[PDB]
Design an enzyme around this catalytic site. Structure first.
Site, PDB file in Angstrom:
ATOM      1  N   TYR A 147       6.638  11.603 -44.381  1.00 47.37           N
ATOM      2  CA  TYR A 147       7.332  11.476 -43.108  1.00 47.37           C
ATOM      3  C   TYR A 147       7.266  10.023 -42.658  1.00 47.37           C
ATOM      4  O   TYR A 147       6.263   9.569 -42.103  1.00 47.37           O
ATOM      5  CB  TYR A 147       6.770  12.467 -42.081  1.00 47.37           C
ATOM      6  CG  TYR A 147       6.911  13.871 -42.609  1.00 47.37           C
ATOM      7  CD1 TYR A 147       8.142  14.509 -42.596  1.00 47.37           C
ATOM      8  CD2 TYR A 147       5.838  14.526 -43.189  1.00 47.37           C
ATOM      9  CE1 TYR A 147       8.293  15.780 -43.112  1.00 47.37           C
ATOM     10  CE2 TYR A 147       5.975  15.803 -43.708  1.00 47.37           C
ATOM     11  CZ  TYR A 147       7.207  16.424 -43.671  1.00 47.37           C
ATOM     12  OH  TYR A 147       7.359  17.693 -44.188  1.00 47.37           O
ATOM     13  N   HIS A 189      -0.790  14.927 -36.665  1.00 48.45           N
ATOM     14  CA  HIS A 189      -0.820  13.470 -36.519  1.00 48.45           C
ATOM     15  C   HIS A 189       0.109  12.982 -35.413  1.00 48.45           C
ATOM     16  O   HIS A 189       0.851  12.013 -35.598  1.00 48.45           O
ATOM     17  CB  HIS A 189      -0.472  12.805 -37.861  1.00 48.45           C
ATOM     18  CG  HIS A 189      -1.137  11.482 -38.084  1.00 48.45           C
ATOM     19  ND1 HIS A 189      -0.628  10.298 -37.590  1.00 48.45           N
ATOM     20  CD2 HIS A 189      -2.258  11.150 -38.772  1.00 48.45           C
ATOM     21  CE1 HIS A 189      -1.414   9.300 -37.951  1.00 48.45           C
ATOM     22  NE2 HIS A 189      -2.408   9.788 -38.669  1.00 48.45           N
TER      23      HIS A 189
END
Ligand SMILES: [Cl-]
Ligand SMILES: [Cl-]
Ligand SMILES: [Cl-]
Ligand SMILES: [Cl-]
Ligand SMILES: [Cl-]
Ligand SMILES: [Cl-]
Ligand SMILES: [Cl-]
Ligand SMILES: [Cl-]
Ligand SMILES: [Cl-]
Ligand SMILES: [Cl-]
Ligand SMILES: [Mg+2]
Ligand SMILES: [Mg+2]
Ligand SMILES: [Mg+2]
Ligand SMILES: [Mg+2]
Ligand SMILES: [Mg+2]
Lengths: 400, 405, 400, 400, 405
Positions: free
Chosen positions: B163, B213
């Site tokens: 990502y 995260h």
């Protein structure tokens, strides 16, 4: 007016404490004698530390109480509770409980009434009873359940398994279990019980403080579809604030409190409606006197009562609980484990359930006493109770 | 006798700070020497800004500390923390942490005991360990999971990943601002599918962890919690950024999902309300970010009162000295739960000899005097600091806006 | 549309950071150059750790920013704040503040407007000013007060004494004070000031986190009759929950926040109306960009603004605060300490109060820059700031 | 310093208000002229009561403002808001908004910058856009959805049906609907959309305050599995305390606020995290000045922004929202309805979405003005908006 | 190396519990011996029920502990606390405390460090001390105050006293129940007058402390707080019994009075809400009542987070071993405020040699290895346990009802 009171005062003449182990558990009885010749019996059973309770009664409560008027149960309770300055806790409270129950026994004997009638009488005909079905296989559980259903029980506490695992090297001595395995097995137990029995009976289960809070909440959500009558001790007493998260998202019925011996442990719990059934051990909270007050406190908040009634308690203690249970309007159910022959000899006439109900004694007093000669045949024996050294796979202690 | 306190003093004679990059990350070690000739080592690793930490140690903590008695760690910590007036934060705290850990190392060496024994000894035999399985494919993920399962790990943090980087299959504006692009909906979809696939293949063979995260907005975090709840993750980490943790109440009210958070924390105001309100199940603080061993002990005790457990942040951007310290903390503190671990590479092992590796899913505390791991000064010189921009921190959503990375 | 934007983009060509110590304090300026030839100046002053701020700017913010479009202040601020992953705190925020202020300077210069006009213009004509009167005797305080009143100031922060005592044997090296003596002297100071001056002027006082919570509450009750304009930093930032007890029983006006460098330090404080004036140091919170947002946040809650304006801040930083102060509707007052000659040479055209008011600059940009050649005459010099090793009589550290 | 300020003051010379109805809606523009010859344009559109807004501007704001310095937007906003003593509300706020936006237009024109650059620049490249798909059949909805997906939209607000029923005898005149039918049809709409399109696009839906609180909570639970991007106005503004029950048990994303014109309507809502997206109509809250503050307020609480952008708003208002949207970091998405030819003639150069994105204007100022001559071809026309007389089957009014 | 943990183990070889009454109080010492021949000493003093504590140690803790590794204090504490299933309370906690303190003594001796140095060292030079001035008259009170002021004390707990015994000038019922009678209104009146007189005579010369000792009902406590607030007591102690501390919110909302509470506590539920809600300024726990050094450290850290300071209960009914332990805790924990002290008599000093006395209003931590104070076994035998009824605990109000004593 003081003559009349004194004309009827009932002076305490002796206090004794007997530990007896007729069967599996060290049991503790307090006996109070009075100048009137009326003798009372009480339960002081803290099975893990019985000599400490006996020392407390013999060396401290006896010289405090000899000569005082047994009639004034409330003053003597208030006085005993604060007598050592520091207070609360299992050793002091059990010692006081033995005296308190014996004083109530004496008052009911003098009133010529069963104890529950002294309280104000019955608010139910009898108290429903639940029993313990514990086995390491499902078929062993089915066998025990089938037997209990035949006897007329409608509520049964079921436990599957007993509590391999990936420990560290050279794991510290202790009693090991695995929380994830315990959860998996218990959810599967409920699923199987509902599949076989449907709604034939109420299923109870005791988590016995074996989980962390995140596990407790997951378990509540996993188990709720099976509608347990109650899930007991889903958290240890020091973590009951975490019950709010369960209450906010699960409909599971909760019971807690057998470990309590300080009112701070139960006040916020009840005020905040964090449990549905209070499970206090009457001798741990200091006897009949505080049990009545706590029963009343709970009623105001809509909390019901299921006093702890384990094997490690005298049949005197059990009879007292049945008196409390037929009297207090918010009493729900009485836990019961069958008495064995030696115990029945030491404590004659102990009631057993009939068709799922326990009936209060109807003779004067508590209705069950201790045979002193029989008790002598079974003196105290040291037991370590190693299960209390409960460890997780990494070797750390968890509340047992 | 009056003179005894001063006779057993251990005078700080030198303070040094070394940056070394044996492998992928700039690591920071603080070294404290005493006049007696005892040497302590500590971790000050804030990988993204290492020269700033070194300036902090060399130019400010050094003249402050030389000459003072190393024995009084608590005083020196309290004094260091307020010494610049303004305080808290990643640069100051990491510099202080390096000193604090080294002072504890010195004390343990002087006691001739392993660090955890100074604390009061073990409350477990060893600490369970989790590893990182990350792949851009499910098959690649299965491969890594299978490997760790073979080594006896029972806990694995799984990310069906990538990502960031260029916006390949992302509908951005025309001429998107340079940055590391990701799509929150794709990330959520992929992650839910990952858990579903993992449970179908492995069932309950191992505990699955996942690190969000801080990639989501609050409404997405609550949706995600409900979507993965059924897969029973061991924990979902950093489901929100530190500045939005009040939104955790919404999740706690309706989901049973296990939550971990806090590797970003460097100010006590970030964790106090969090723990008091039982908003997480595991605290994840980076020990050097909160100022070292001294506050880590206090925070562990604070958490224990509220029933919160500990999983200190143990990334590759930390010295093996830092890791050993965490294992000492982890075998001692009763509410320690699990230790994150990533395997050490050859260069790193050369600069920091005797770094412990997990055995059958457990990390064992060092049993020699002190922390048990030091830095080889000559070896560290072979790997000087090297600038890295850490481009992933310029994290952007498809419309080109920054999101917390 | 992208051509036009690019036709007007303003690429950052250089970033520099200069520490200068013209007088008593190490001051830190960030300078941002752009391809358009427009140069911006910003304050990054964290006087206790200036080399750390310079390292942060030179080694990290410079390579991050060169080549990026200075026009997009908001994106660059959001990007810089999270760029090191870990964030908040005095070293990073001051470095960012220097850049942020310089970017605003550039935008206002390009707009050909004073900074406050870029914001949306004035909501007041000028900002009222308070000064510092500090002395070790009351008559020394009177002398300073008399001088300030003559100059037209209506608000003066007064401190009596400087901060014998019963220590232990061989007390640890540090800066000692006695909390009880400090409280006694300060209450007496207020009493004397009110006796001599009545309501001639507003009296401010800075407790500077020197007290424990119980002392803070006692002090608030002791001081409230003297109606201080505000009592500043009555508690350290980690103990502001204790302000609720003060708010529940005292009418004392409170100011807090110069120490803040993490939004978690101020959110609950403001939401719960625990202070009346927010005192943040703009560079500590990350520059103009977050100062505007915080000003707006406070306005919603009825909290007013008194940004920290100590000597340890550039005249650039002071000018920025005056721009913020004439613009933000909830700005209340500006702290001011007279500039000395060396400082005025390094930072020309710095405004000074006129009749108790500071006026915003009216030329384009911030209005104050740094003379680079003059700054070179006064390089950084190490100072230990020993007062931060503040100790109580028993030798323990207290927040300084 | 006052010369310089005055050397740059910008005196308001005229205020005008034009209602124009090029297409379906009465639109309201405020025009502010200044001595500098710079003219600003603003949106004041309250389509249901346009003559009241025009009276407010012409008879009251004009004589108040002529002669005052347009530079000081913040003071003029604070002053205008309280000028009638009583305040807040749709008529006053829209009138003020028209002036406020025009003042910002003037300042950006004078700065020679696009409005969003005056704010502090971009924090995104462009803002994502959602459109409206409304039909009385599912296939009509599919047709509109297919067309929008082809154009590159990733977010579409979908509504099925328009809003037989069992009324009383002789039902009172009004616009009838049935809440249960509306709920049933909408849940079925979502179910069908997910079946046909899966996760191809984000589905939005506007409940438009049509439900009672118990219905709203049921709907949230019924709809949550379909993961709407947001459910808008699930409750009316006077009942938003009921959102806590939804927030406690549903993960549904919520948007609310197009109706707001008093800050008391949004403060508790945001502080308590009761919505995920704030939907205020910028002119209803008083213009750009308060929109910036509210955007900042929301950011602190983690609430995102989706300003109301209906057809009943000028393209000037739409351009302003795109400026706010590319600037405010917490802006999420811009609602858009295609402009028709007459509207485009009255307001030239209005941006339309390109591949699902709206791009901010890059010329100086807002970037869109009104052609005064073209506006004259379409004067105000009375419309009753009968849909606002919304009634339930028993004939009672419900919030429309 | 694999064997190192076990090589440095210190095996518990014996546990003993001795009751001694050198002067006015039955004191309880626990002695732990290791196979290596290291001996640790701890305080288990619950004076009112000493035989119960001794039974607890001799019959239950002894068979539990013999053979186990003394090094792992934390494990042994966690294990001991839950070992009887039911837990908390004065008998169990005092027995556990005696063991815990002795294990810390052993660890400090093995480290060859003073106890506070194991903790992390000093955070102050010494701890300030307060003494007890009690008299049935103001002149007698002035005499004692003058004496302590001469010795350099700056803090004195003053009681214009006698509250108990026969009901001399008290309107009781006819034939009052036997007990120790007092009148709450007389006590309040006398105490307010005491503070007024003390401030008139001494001004701000010293800090005045006073112990309400749970003698009041809640409405009286709030009234009393308002009545003495103006006299600025250093603290008012035990203004309510532990079971009524929610009533402190009423006081906190309207009075600035400094409050101390907690000497009675032996269950964490008694202090958690108290501290979280900032209901007191000083925690007063009796270290042995809460289970020893191990939980005292955690509680001190917990308090520090909330800004609550520490004043451990240090009455004459505690061993000088207990006192030395408290001084170690007090020089170490940053939030420790003051140490209560009553002078040791000759017999007590003989049984417990080298017991520290204050110097110029300060107590100094021991600087030799271990706690620094032990019990002389032969001397202790000269003073066996002697029953005392502690009649003051049968505290009665004029109508004959029990009140918390
Ligand atoms: Cl007890
Ligand atoms: Cl056993
Ligand atoms: Cl694209
Ligand atoms: Cl990189
Ligand atoms: Cl920082
Ligand atoms: Cl200095
Ligand atoms: Cl209106
Ligand atoms: Cl119409
Ligand atoms: Cl009488
Ligand atoms: Cl006595
Ligand atoms: Mg049970
Ligand atoms: Mg992480
Ligand atoms: Mg200040
Ligand atoms: Mg709408
Ligand atoms: Mg006391």
């Amino acid at each position: 007016l003081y003559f009349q009171s004194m004309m009827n005062k009932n002076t305490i003449s002796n206090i004794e404490c007997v530990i007896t182990k007729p069967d599996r558990h060290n049991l503790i009885t307090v006996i109070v004698e009075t100048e009137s010749g009326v003798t009372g019996y009480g339960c002081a059973t803290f099975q893990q530390r019985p000599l400490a309770v006996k020392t407390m009664v013999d060396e401290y409560l006896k010289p405090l109480l000899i000569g005082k008027d047994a009639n004034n149960i409330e003053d003597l309770w208030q006085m005993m509770m604060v007598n050592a300055y520091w207070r609360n806790g299992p050793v002091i409270n059990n010692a006081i409980s033995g005296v308190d129950m014996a004083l109530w026994d004496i008052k009911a004997k003098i009133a010529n009434m069963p104890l529950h009638q002294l309280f104000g009488g019955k608010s139910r005909d009898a108290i429903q009873v639940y029993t313990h079905a514990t086995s390491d296989t499902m078929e062993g559980l089915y066998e025990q359940v089938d037997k209990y259903l035949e006897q007329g029980y409608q509520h049964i506490r079921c436990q599957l398994g007993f509590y391999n695992i990936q420990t560290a090297q050279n794991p510290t001595q202790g009693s090991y279990y695995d929380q994830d395995q315990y959860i998996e097995n218990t959810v599967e137990m409920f699923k199987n019980l509902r599949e076989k029995y449907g709604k034939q009976f109420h299923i109870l289960h005791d988590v016995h403080e074996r989980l962390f809070p995140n596990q407790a909440i997951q378990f509540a959500k996993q188990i709720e579809q099976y509608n347990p009558f109650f899930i007991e001790d889903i958290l240890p007493p020091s973590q009951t604030e975490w019950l709010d998260n369960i209450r906010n998202q699960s409909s599971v019925s909760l019971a807690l409190g057998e470990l309590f011996n300080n009112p701070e442990e139960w006040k916020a719990l009840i005020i905040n409606r964090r449990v549905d059934f209070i499970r206090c051990h009457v001798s741990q909270i200091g006897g009949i006197t505080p049990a009545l007050k706590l029963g009343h406190f709970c009623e105001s908040f809509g909390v019901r009562i299921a006093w702890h009634c384990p094997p490690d308690m005298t049949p005197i203690g059990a009879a007292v609980n049945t008196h409390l249970n037929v009297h207090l309007h918010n009493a729900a159910i009485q836990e019961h484990v069958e008495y064995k022959a030696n115990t029945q000899r030491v404590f004659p006439n102990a009631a057993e359930p009939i068709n799922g109900y326990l009936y209060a004694s109807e003779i004067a007093g508590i209705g069950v006493e201790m045979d002193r000669e029989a008790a002598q045949d079974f003196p105290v024996e040291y037991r370590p109770h190693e299960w209390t050294q409960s460890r997780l796979p990494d070797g750390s202690i968890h509340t047992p």
